[PDB]
Design a protein around this motif. Structure first.
Motif, PDB file in Angstrom:
ATOM      1  N   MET A  48       0.832  -1.194   0.000  1.00 34.22           N
ATOM      2  CA  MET A  48       0.000   0.000   0.000  1.00 34.22           C
ATOM      3  C   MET A  48       0.875   1.256   0.000  1.00 34.22           C
ATOM      4  O   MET A  48       2.103   1.172   0.021  1.00 34.22           O
ATOM      5  CB  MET A  48      -0.929   0.036   1.224  1.00 34.22           C
ATOM      6  N   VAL A 117      -5.269   3.493  -6.941  1.00 30.74           N
ATOM      7  CA  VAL A 117      -6.242   3.967  -5.978  1.00 30.74           C
ATOM      8  C   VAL A 117      -6.537   5.457  -6.206  1.00 30.74           C
ATOM      9  O   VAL A 117      -5.685   6.240  -6.659  1.00 30.74           O
ATOM     10  CB  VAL A 117      -5.813   3.623  -4.533  1.00 30.74           C
ATOM     11  N   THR A 118      -7.774   5.840  -5.857  1.00 30.13           N
ATOM     12  CA  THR A 118      -8.238   7.213  -5.967  1.00 30.13           C
ATOM     13  C   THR A 118      -7.673   8.026  -4.805  1.00 30.13           C
ATOM     14  O   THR A 118      -7.288   9.183  -4.982  1.00 30.13           O
ATOM     15  CB  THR A 118      -9.776   7.273  -6.018  1.00 30.13           C
ATOM     16  N   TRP A 120      -8.971   8.499  -0.471  1.00 21.44           N
ATOM     17  CA  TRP A 120     -10.263   8.894   0.070  1.00 21.44           C
ATOM     18  C   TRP A 120     -10.072   9.693   1.355  1.00 21.44           C
ATOM     19  O   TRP A 120     -10.966  10.427   1.770  1.00 21.44           O
ATOM     20  CB  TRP A 120     -11.234   7.698   0.198  1.00 21.44           C
ATOM     21  N   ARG A 140     -14.251  10.794  -8.271  1.00 22.97           N
ATOM     22  CA  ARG A 140     -12.887  10.273  -8.298  1.00 22.97           C
ATOM     23  C   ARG A 140     -12.700   9.171  -9.354  1.00 22.97           C
ATOM     24  O   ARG A 140     -11.604   9.023  -9.891  1.00 22.97           O
ATOM     25  CB  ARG A 140     -12.428   9.915  -6.878  1.00 22.97           C
ATOM     26  N   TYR A 141     -13.767   8.402  -9.654  1.00 29.33           N
ATOM     27  CA  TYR A 141     -13.703   7.323 -10.641  1.00 29.33           C
ATOM     28  C   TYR A 141     -13.672   7.882 -12.075  1.00 29.33           C
ATOM     29  O   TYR A 141     -13.024   7.318 -12.961  1.00 29.33           O
ATOM     30  CB  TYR A 141     -14.602   6.117 -10.284  1.00 29.33           C
ATOM     31  N   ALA A 187      -8.973  -1.781  -5.937  1.00 32.98           N
ATOM     32  CA  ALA A 187      -9.505  -2.154  -4.643  1.00 32.98           C
ATOM     33  C   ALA A 187     -10.861  -1.470  -4.392  1.00 32.98           C
ATOM     34  O   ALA A 187     -11.209  -1.159  -3.259  1.00 32.98           O
ATOM     35  CB  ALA A 187      -8.461  -1.855  -3.586  1.00 32.98           C
ATOM     36  N   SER A 190     -17.343  -0.002  -3.735  1.00 28.87           N
ATOM     37  CA  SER A 190     -18.607   0.595  -4.137  1.00 28.87           C
ATOM     38  C   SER A 190     -18.986   0.131  -5.547  1.00 28.87           C
ATOM     39  O   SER A 190     -18.202  -0.510  -6.258  1.00 28.87           O
ATOM     40  CB  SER A 190     -18.468   2.101  -4.111  1.00 28.87           C
ATOM     41  N   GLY A 193     -16.616   1.774  -7.986  1.00 33.00           N
ATOM     42  CA  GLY A 193     -15.276   1.205  -7.951  1.00 33.00           C
ATOM     43  C   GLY A 193     -15.226  -0.142  -8.666  1.00 33.00           C
ATOM     44  O   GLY A 193     -14.289  -0.417  -9.407  1.00 33.00           O
ATOM     45  N   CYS A 206     -10.989  -7.075  -2.385  1.00 40.47           N
ATOM     46  CA  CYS A 206     -12.028  -6.757  -1.417  1.00 40.47           C
ATOM     47  C   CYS A 206     -11.617  -7.264  -0.028  1.00 40.47           C
ATOM     48  O   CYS A 206     -10.621  -7.968   0.114  1.00 40.47           O
ATOM     49  CB  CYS A 206     -13.359  -7.356  -1.860  1.00 40.47           C
ATOM     50  N   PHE A 207     -12.443  -6.944   0.982  1.00 40.28           N
ATOM     51  CA  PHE A 207     -12.211  -7.213   2.391  1.00 40.28           C
ATOM     52  C   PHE A 207     -12.810  -8.555   2.808  1.00 40.28           C
ATOM     53  O   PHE A 207     -13.981  -8.832   2.554  1.00 40.28           O
ATOM     54  CB  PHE A 207     -12.846  -6.101   3.237  1.00 40.28           C
TER      55      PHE A 207
END
Ligand SMILES: Cc1cc2nc3c(=O)[nH]c(=O)nc-3n(C[C@H](O)[C@H](O)[C@H](O)COP(=O)(O)O)c2cc1C
Length: 334
Positions: A48, A117-118, A120, A140-141, A187, A190, A193, A206-207
């Motif tokens: 990351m 990644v955007t 956040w 952001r997308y 990653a 939403s 995303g 994903c988580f």
């Protein structure tokens, strides 16, 4: 099923506790983790990027290296494992990312990819005057869409004339181009995303969910599959879990309870059988080596799920016991 390691580029890894192991992120420690992971035939290593910490007694993630330069160093002392860096798209112009990706392609012999990644977390950006404003949350997308367009041009043809709301290319050139098709990972959780991932990524992180509920993430994998139908591309789900393993269920439980008992409350306010905030409520597998092997095999049976990204309570010995005691019991790894 594929296995990755989430390398500790931030101090203390993913535990927010005075009872967890205390350590700074160093090249040498990340080198030892990655070389050890490669030895046990882990498929990939990902770092990351976190530009601001959360403080507290443990100064959690106040100490962080930079993802691309870390992964370049790591590529230079490995030979088989895939290597992924994270680009915080607000901080680097796409043509720089393009050239960095080709560079580490040269270092690794074609084993490098990029996690886009955007961002956040407003403070990460505002701290340096580069937060674009509160509109970015919803836009952001669209921003990332233009960004990836430029990358694809540059990797694909070595030039770009793309022009949009956020970027203007006037015959921008990047060469050499990667020696192999460049992998992009995302990653997004939403709807927006996941649509981005379905269009442009090779797979979606994903988580994991809950504690010892390995399949509880299945609805997220289902949404990602639906998103992938809309583009007809094969974009599978890789799921993030913490592994807390030992010789017996009892011993592993005792370790988990001890971590939670040491929770660094101060760092945790800055942030915000259930999940615990001590590892940011990450999906957690806690048990004997055999029990964890079984829950990971349960993960492999979820529609969509092509892999796991692993953190550990202790990475050097966690990787060890994974290779020596867990992996060999896993059907999805034979
Ligand atoms: C494995 C994993 C790694 C991530 N790494 C980063 C990172 O390095 N930097 C960052 O700003 N966000 C990171 N994120 C957050 C996501 O890119 C994403 O913004 C978030 O999951 C929210 O979903 P959405 O963007 O579709 O709303 C990560 C998420 C996951 C699951």
């Amino acid at each position: 099923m594929k296995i990755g390691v989430f390398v500790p580029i931030g101090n203390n890894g993913w535990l927010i506790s005075t009872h967890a192991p205390q350590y700074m992120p160093t090249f040498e420690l990340n080198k030892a983790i990655v070389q050890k992971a490669e030895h046990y035939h882990f498929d990939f290593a990902l770092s990351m990027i976190k530009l601001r910490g959360f403080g507290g007694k443990t100064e959690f993630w106040d100490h962080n290296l930079e993802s691309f330069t870390l992964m370049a160093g790591l590529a230079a002392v490995t030979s088989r494992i895939q290597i992924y860096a994270t680009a915080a798209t607000l901080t680097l112009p796409p043509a720089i990312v393009a050239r960095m990706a080709a560079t580490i392609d040269s270092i690794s012999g074609g084993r490098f990819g990029v996690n886009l990644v955007t961002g956040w977390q407003k403070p990460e950006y505002e701290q340096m005057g580069i937060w674009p404003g509160d509109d970015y949350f919803s836009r952001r997308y669209d921003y990332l869409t233009e960004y990836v367009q430029v990358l694809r041009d540059l990797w694909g043809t070595g030039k770009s004339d793309f022009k949009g709301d956020f970027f203007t290319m006037n015959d921008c050139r990047v060469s050499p181009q990667p020696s192999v098709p460049m992998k992009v990972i995302c990653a997004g959780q939403s709807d927006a995303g996941m649509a981005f991932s379905a269009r442009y990524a090779d797979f979606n992180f994903c988580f994991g969910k809950g504690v010892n509920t390995p399949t509880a993430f299945a609805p997220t994998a289902a949404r990602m599959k639906q998103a992938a139908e809309q583009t007809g591309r094969d974009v599978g789900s890789y799921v993030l879990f913490m592994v807390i393993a030992d010789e017996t269920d009892d011993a592993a439980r005792a370790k988990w309870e001890h971590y939670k008992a040491g929770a660094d409350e101060e760092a945790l306010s800055w942030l915000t059988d259930p999940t615990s905030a001590v590892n940011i409520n990450m999906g957690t597998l806690v048990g004997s080596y055999a029990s964890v092997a079984r829950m990971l095999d349960e993960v492999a049976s979820v529609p969509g799920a092509e892999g796991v990204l692993l953190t550990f309570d202790d990475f050097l010995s966690g990787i060890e016991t994974f290779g020596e005691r867990i992996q060999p019991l896993m059907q999805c790894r034979a």
